[PDB]
Point group: C4
Chain length 302, copies 4
């Protein structure tokens, strides 16, 4: 179908490199709460099954063991691991006392670790899918007298984020005049770093602008050349979740075929009574407007 | 009465979008401590009422159940959910042991979650209402030879915040020369991003300055045009609470009618004996000063 | 003695403003560990004394109460508040069960809160007094062909901090040409914001430089004028404690009499065998060097 | 062998300065999990051995003490310190009640502290050794018409970091024209601070570039002078671990002998099917390319 992009529209990078709970850690945290707990419950049962078997290795280790056999050892383990200590059943032998001592340490430890995970889980920002949105396409048309590359960004579910900032990079394979091969060269796309305009007040959707001039990597991009050019505009938006103070990031990408020459976005903001309304049905919509086909370079130099 | 502003003086945005505890989470945390705990107490009682009924489904589930009936099941639940485990009352049947096992897991879980919430609650900065203040009005008058837009900001209750930074945006509906409709266009208002002056040393109140020149959105704003202009200056102040390391933000807004042409603020700082005193009675006060009615543009080009 | 400075050498601001545990919170956290715990121990004893009296209001509330009287009620309270629940002593009446239920809730709550405080306490950076140091004096002399204001900063106890940044403000009372009174006006002192040099690699001590040119507030400062000038250079250094990720700040100040014209710092760095040594005995030391008495302005315009 | 560098290739600074758990704190946290817990287990056993001896100072302090003697006092201590409270063994004397009360307080405290440490331990980023890599050498050759200093950086184990930024400093001993001795003077090496290019999108390896021009400290560095020059390029890369929101830093260094004149890096990126592959075998590899031996200064002025 289409060429292989380096970053998916959802922000996922299609890279592959070559030849302490670090990996499974994020997994646990990533899990939805219901599966997070169902997950802890499983470990709980396993640890209890394990210590229960250890107690059974000794003879009459537990006073008033009920029910007799493995079952009682299991429930005693439960009250021990969680430090409940009803005590009707309790260690009756030195061997049982050592097993209980070890289980008590392991139980506190496990509670400590599980508690840490819960906190981090709680501090995590909601998935991008439900917080930040980018327009499917970007466009290029004249704005305030200059050919401009634009795309839209909006913050749905109020994720109470502050310190919102946006950065844009152009990914393109190229060869330098000296003959250096640069497969995924990254060029800066100025979207406000020199005016402070890249520090966003993102409440309602915004149309991000990259002015195409002599310093822009798109200085010589024309309607025609777009048809044979190969590039990828990568967008990075970062913010901090106020409630937690956690820094989050949302990313998207626009390949050459997802940039529409001679288009303009429809507005999404409208003034009502008591408030301004955001019509999300127009979020991705654009329409054609009179735009010259020439690159800024062809125009400054013709 | 007055037009509909996009941001209230208190920082609240009047926006409305279109068609895991995420929402109720902030609510709980937002609550005052007394209601936070009264809130946890309610859940505690409910969980205990719930497990108490479960125990009652079995026959003589609890040894020495006291009082007989639901009451004893309730108190046993209490000592179980909180992992106290006095044990005088304790599971007497396999059924009761399974219910207790489940309750113990739920109790640890609940303690873990409630503990997480408490921490976040503790890390939260005090409300703006009691930490950062903005002058009710902004003014425009000559300072150091240049027409300047000014407003005041101060930090009351020492919220031990560092990394204090301020940003200002001009919100205004406009139409581009190419005919693009921009309902809530955001233009940058330079208040120090090019000198480092936007990185504030906020101890005593400060008068924030926006120099009106050729690059300012207010380049052609005159006393006369102000009377028919429609805009909103949005102010964003961010800082970090030292004690907790949490990043916070305070916002305010100034509509065209809240900007006074030809005014100057009264001073609030005074040198005493041993310290400098801040007279907050003059915080919002301004007085008229000789100021030309022309815009900077009319003056540079007349 | 000397005039009243706005910021003490130790970073303390001498300001006074006018007419939920927020205040006492920092106090507790500020406390040294030994007093933090001795402080929690006191609350523990008080809470236990309180619940002990409540139990005593009922008759024979506790089974096997030992010792008889208040003492037994106190120890039972202890095992209850901390959720130990030995259970030899346990609620014997409905009244005692309600008191115990309330105490159990309060105990979990207290443990939760105390645990939160401990975490924050642990995340706090060590006091400036033992982490960041500033030279007692600043100096002004020629460096690389330009009159420069300099002072020294060093990081003692490796506080594992990253993202170290420095900012400098000139505090001075002045009157604008238009007649505006500005008691504590803050002017920016460029120390690297336009080269990235304000982002410090602070391992060994550094000499911070402010080049005095036409854009500097000190453009017309001469040896003579220094004798009658009144100002205060406020220095703000911020960093993040790597281990905890907490942002901290150290501040100092230099009044006009603490700035030495025609001086240069002695070096503190020396190359040994296997490492570079820092001689802190030379940290504050400076010596006189041939320096013209004229301000940069008198020199550019003479 | 080789001269003494100020920063090792692994980021370690070879500095030595002159004449509350702060030091041992990082140690504990630094420890691998297995040793972290084995470490807590030791304290646990010691505290229990200690309280066990205290109980033994009294006569028949514990009911149903089992086993008789120190052993029973030890196990009772265990159930007390961890707040399990089986209660079969329990305080029988006022003396034992006071010791238990003290142990209970110490146990909660210890659990609180250990829990805090665990959280911080969990929030720590994985060691650089397994997260960020720098090329062994840097090179200098022509790129896009300009003599450029380059080195490579890559992020191995996806440490989910955002807000990635890079800074570069030139460390060199020098003497100012005025005769000031500067042993370890730090000069800024521009690697994108004026284009936003220092804010990296680090997924696949990147070649960092420092353009050598009139403002560069290397303006007069030639192939010949490199042979007798003495300097050290220090590289600082900072990022935030998304999962935890913790800011981390990786550093490296390049002495004059580790900078290869007239070299170029081999590419590491290759386009496969479904993804872009990173060949880490070429990471450190460079080859010679036609490069003039003259410094930029000799060339601009010849
Ligand atoms: C007394 C019981 C208290 C239970 C409290 C449960 C809080 C669960 C919080 O979940 C988190 O909410 C965030 C939004 O706030 C999401 O961004 C995040 O992804 C999600 O994991
Ligand atoms: C042993 C018992 C210890 C109890 C400690 C209770 C600490 C409660 C802290 O509350 C928080 O204080 C912050 C200011 O410090 C406010 O900004 C924040 O809004 C508020 O929620
Ligand atoms: C199993 C018991 C574990 C006990 C752990 C106690 C850790 C105490 C940490 O104190 C903190 O250390 C920081 C430096 O690391 C200081 O900057 C900070 O001011 C100080 O409050
Ligand atoms: C119910 C039991 C749950 C146990 C959870 C154990 C989590 C251990 C996390 O360790 C941390 O992982 C980070 C990467 O995620 C590393 O960067 C860090 O160095 C390492 O210390
Ligand atoms: K118990
Ligand atoms: K018990
Ligand atoms: K606990
Ligand atoms: K942070
Ligand atoms: K944090
Ligand atoms: K317990
Ligand atoms: K218990």
């Amino acid at each position: 179908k289409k060429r292989q992009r380096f970053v998916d529209k959802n922000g996922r990078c299609n890279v592959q490199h070559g030849n302490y709970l670090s990996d499974l850690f994020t997994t646990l945290v990533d899990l939805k709460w219901r599966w997070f707990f169902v997950s802890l419950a499983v470990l709980f049962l396993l640890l209890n099954t394990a210590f229960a078997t250890l107690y059974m290795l000794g003879s009459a280790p537990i006073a008033n063991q009920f029910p007799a056999g493995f079952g009682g050892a299991f429930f005693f383990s439960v009250e021990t691991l969680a430090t409940v200590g009803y005590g009707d059943m309790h260690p009756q032998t030195v061997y049982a006392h050592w097993i209980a001592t070890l289980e008590i340490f392991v139980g506190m430890s496990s509670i400590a670790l599980a508690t840490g995970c819960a906190f981090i889980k709680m501090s995590q920002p909601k998935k991008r899918a439900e917080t930040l949105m980018f327009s499917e396409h970007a466009v290029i048309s004249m704005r305030d007298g200059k050919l401009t590359l634009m795309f839209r960004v909006g913050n749905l579910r109020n994720s109470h984020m502050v310190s919102a900032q946006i950065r844009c990079k152009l990914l393109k394979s190229r060869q330098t005049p000296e003959g250096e091969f640069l497969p995924l060269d990254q060029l800066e796309l100025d979207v406000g770093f020199s005016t402070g305009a890249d520090q966003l007040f993102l409440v309602s959707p915004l149309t991000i602008c990259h002015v195409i001039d002599a310093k822009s990597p798109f200085y010589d991009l024309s309607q025609r050349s777009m048809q044979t050019e190969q590039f990828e505009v990568v967008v990075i938006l970062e913010g901090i979740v106020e409630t937690t103070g956690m820094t989050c990031q949302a990313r998207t990408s626009y390949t050459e075929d997802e940039v529409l020459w001679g288009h303009r976005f429809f507005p999404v903001i409208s003034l009502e009574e008591g408030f301004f309304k955001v019509d999300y049905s127009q979020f991705h919509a654009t329409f054609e407007v009179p735009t010259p086909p020439y690159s800024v370079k062809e125009q400054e130099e013709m």
